[PDB]
């Protein structure tokens, strides 16, 4: 391999796909991970009828396209749409040939072996990539945060995970999964807004509510005190202008929505909050490393972008953890891209050049080589 060929990093997110070149400070492309198909034949006469659309092209045509999500809770459920998304990322977004650059892919923790083998087969047979590698999202997030040991609370758009890492070791016995992410939060926001008198039923109204969530919602340090303040004062209300010019008022729903992350009971889910989840994950590890896990608690994912979430996590983990442990929450400003940042970092290291799965290794061992090279 020529030392001048930069490797490609592709963050496979449930809600947003991020792609770029190794060494760059930020991903060159960030688009939704969706695939749209025309609802009726003949609706696109003259607009270059395509059998399918991907990314923003399908997002802008949601009114006339049936959108599907090939990634559900961080697991690939439709491989044809995933191949379409990869072809898009390679040819339209990055505008490069995948057979000329190594491709580093990200996967959620505890990814089924069949999915890894299928990704390897797709990359080596469909795109003819010279080499590739698969890394865990939380591991890349930690490697981007500034540490090799610690616990990462990665909360994306489809699923949230607490991956305890010691010297880069995502401990499978201590990894906990929670089916609560930005999607369920957007659904709950729609629900509570319908309770307030603002009914959102269509998929475009769902995107409007998602934008409202990303713009106005925040994590309160004290839920009861914040509710009391909202009930006794309107200083916590904020106005939002709808696409049709109508201005609506968002009240306590700003912090009631993200509160589900700490109290899933609001969603009817019998699961522990993200703080309790992280505490239990740290407790499943050896006592010798719990100190470092507490001192290196990192936040990642788009769902972790709520203002004040870091302070709430600090408070909760300090109240739950022993008094002798020093709790430190790490929330980088660009934590939404920590996965891709760590991927690019790992791909830009010379010592990592020996970790790529070459086409020869794949042809000799098959897709199973991922289980021998990717951990």
């Amino acid at each position: 391999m020529d030392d001048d060929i930069a490797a490609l990093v592709v963050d496979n997110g449930s809600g947003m796909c991020k792609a770029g070149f190794a060494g760059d400070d930020a991903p060159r492309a960030v688009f939704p991970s969706i695939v749209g198909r025309p609802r009726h034949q003949g609706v696109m006469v003259g607009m270059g009828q395509k059998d399918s659309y991907v990314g923003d092209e399908a997002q802008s045509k949601r009114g006339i396209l049936t959108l599907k999500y090939p990634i559900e809770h961080g697991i690939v459920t439709n491989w044809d749409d995933m191949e379409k998304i990869w072809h898009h990322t390679f040819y339209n977004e990055l505008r490069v040939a995948p057979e000329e650059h190594p491709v580093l892919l990200t996967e959620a923790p505890l990814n089924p072996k069949a999915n890894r083998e299928k990704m390897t087969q797709i990359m080596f047979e469909t795109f003819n990539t010279p080499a590739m590698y698969v890394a865990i999202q939380a591991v890349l997030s930690l490697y981007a945060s500034g540490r090799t040991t610690g616990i990462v609370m990665d909360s994306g758009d489809g699923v949230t995970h607490t991956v305890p890492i010691y010297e880069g070791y995502a401990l499978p016995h201590a990894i906990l999964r929670l089916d609560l992410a930005g999607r369920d939060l957007t659904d709950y926001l729609m629900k509570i807004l319908t309770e307030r008198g603002y009914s959102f039923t269509t998929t475009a109204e769902r995107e409007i509510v998602r934008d409202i969530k990303e713009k106005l919602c925040y994590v309160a340090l004290d839920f009861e005190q914040e509710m009391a303040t909202a009930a006794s004062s309107s200083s916590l209300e904020k106005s939002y202008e709808l696409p049709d010019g109508q201005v609506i008022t968002i009240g306590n729903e700003r912090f009631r929505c993200p509160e589900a992350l700490f109290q899933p009971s609001f969603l009817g889910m019998e699961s522990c909050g993200i703080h309790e989840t992280t505490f239990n994950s740290i407790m499943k590890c050896d006592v010798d490393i719990r100190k470092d896990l507490y001192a290196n608690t990192v936040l990642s994912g788009g769902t972790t972008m709520y203002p004040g979430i870091a302070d709430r996590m600090q408070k909760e983990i300090t109240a739950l953890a022993p008094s002798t442990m020093k709790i430190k929450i790490i929330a980088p400003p660009e934590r939404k891209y920590s996965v891709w940042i760590g991927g690019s970092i790992l791909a830009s290291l010379s010592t990592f050049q020996q970790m790529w799965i070459s086409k020869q290794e794949y042809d000799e061992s098959g897709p199973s080589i991922v289980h021998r090279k990717c951990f």
């Binding site: 490697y143 500034g146 090799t148 290291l349 010592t351 990592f352 970790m355």
Partner: protein, 49 residues
């Protein structure tokens, strides 16, 4: 495999320290210039009296 990768990425933090060395050098310069130049000017102005 994962210990090898961890030790390989441990070099990135030595590189971050090499970067922080830039800030250390900046501070060293900003302080040494100030102190030495001020002391030189002061002692020269005191001897010329």
């Amino acid at each position: 495999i994962a210990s090898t990768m961890a030790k390989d990425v441990r070099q990135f933090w030595s590189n971050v320290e090499k970067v922080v060395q830039f800030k250390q050098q900046s501070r060293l310069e900003e302080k040494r210039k100030k102190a030495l130049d001020l002391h030189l000017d002061f002692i020269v102005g005191q001897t010329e009296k």
